[PDB]
């Protein structure tokens, strides 16, 4: 294909067909469809540091190195037991993937996909399997950080001195950490708890201070919510002073003091929030919802905490993604087989591309940001 | 040339020869030298939103659209009176350049370099001239914001409706604003004053609130310092709570409370600071100095405010540039004819490339960030 820049390239997951579309974000057009990625019914991805490749992590444990410029699969491996949790290191050389069977982290060379390190999680007493690993992120200092669901731990894997990592293990951090995030500046790791309420916070500048329990009320309490009905911590937005997060099993966006981790306001919204996102200029909060309210997207003023507008793009709004500078927001409408493009200042639709059951949408500016 | 990503591509200014080198940031190599850019003895640049092109603003008023992938000049014009102050719009379509003759802002189609809007500054009495324009930035909302040195004004040019902007003019903001910055979140515009002390701050979210004077004692005071010896506001670094900035004519880096805009600390450093930069993870502050101390770079712990180390890359250290995720820092050593790449976590040089009087070094991840 002809020469083109990689800075405005997007990847759209087609969740029922094991395929992706590669998108020209500036022209608002589809460049290609690539097939052969297996089970993408759930999927995530990261980009190489030059933006030429996406690493797609599929529900089948597939790891696909996708060449966005040659518009083809470059390399692919399938490892049963690997999850969609995948991350890329600060220097772009290592791609880590969590696994839930037997439980641990595997780290691959970003060029060849050859195995560089296998990190088994704690072996469960009286068993021949390990703790599931969840909440894998990359962090500054050529580190990966992740949580152990069954045994209640957080570990740091430090690759700064070589391919055999230095491991730091924090035990008894909380019952069943099920997901985690790293703050946008790369300093704080926060794991949400499923076996009790609260979140476990680690200051990655000062890991010697240990893990700190914060936001002690945030969780399912005594409700029997399954794991997958808990908030996805990717659906948290953390600003400088404020965080906007989905309520656990309620139709509210909670506003948190991001310093003391206390709720300061609550916003009634048109459904159970699934993802809470920020326009890149921090002035608007964008929210999508769980079925039966997943035909709507609400836009909230970050200052007044009032709903500005309720958009209705169509049935099955799974994911959204802003352009790097925020001139666009892209919205997957699964049950309308459309990937829409909107102007988030006018709140008007400026494009709508056909797609097969579209889900995750990712643009290549993620390549330059820790945690993405 | 062959297919390659754009995400790790950089541009190095060779300031005496009117040329640049295009750099592969991952391989740490030079891909090409491109000549024919006129007078780059002063120069700045921004990138297209697909990271394929750089727009180089030359001291001769040259505007060069440089193809990083084809490794050639794609388009070039020379606009009499244009300054090196240039910026690119939130949607990537418009490139604006400040102008001292006749005085105003010129706006160009980023694809063709067609002149699409001319904004004259306020007229000056008794001359066939307008105020010269300084401190031009892009801002969210498809805006450009700039200051008028001679008439003491700040203007917002809103291009959201097309090529004819809507202008909001703030008068009597302070005597002789000489430079400006926009905060990393894109919310606040701050112009430094030369005719008196202090900074003029405009809240771009609430322009109806006008311009407020902040940091009222920061300036040259009663000292007869010429405008060209005032700090360049590009050399300010603003974090969430703290700013680190060059003192005005003192061998100190000032720590400012970013919320109340008041100095809280002053760090003794090895010369007159020129640029104060932050490692992308906010842990370290990097400082370069004016002659005769421009053979040194100092690294400061952002928490303790102490100098960690004094680096000596060589003579004439004019500029530094971090990679997107912070795994690298690139340092131009003008009088060694060397561009060095350093590991900012080990604080050690890891490689060098030859260059002719290297000055500015810019990597394409800037394409994704308001104000860069």
From Swiss-Prot, chains A, B:
Q: Which Gene3D superfamilies match?
A: C-terminal (heme d1) domain of cytochrome cd1-nitrite reductase
- What is a single Pfam family found in this protein's UniProt entry? Cytochrom_D1
Please give the coiled-coil regions recorded for this protein.
none
Write out the function statement from the record.
Answer: Required for the biosynthesis of heme d1 of nitrite reductase. Could have a dehydrogenase activity yielding sirohydrochlorin from precorrin-2 or dehydrogenation of propionate side chain C17.
> Which cellular component terms (GO) are annotated to the entry?
cytoplasm
Q: Which UniProt keywords apply?
A: Cytoplasm
Q: Where in the cell is it found?
A: Cytoplasm
- Give the species: Pseudomonas aeruginosa (strain ATCC 15692 / DSM 22644 / CIP 104116 / JCM 14847 / LMG 12228 / 1C / PRS 101 / PAO1)
Domain of life here?
Bacteria
Task: Tell me what this protein is called.
Answer: Protein NirF
- Asked whether the UniProt record includes Membrane among its keywords, one would answer no
Its chief place of residence is: cytoplasm
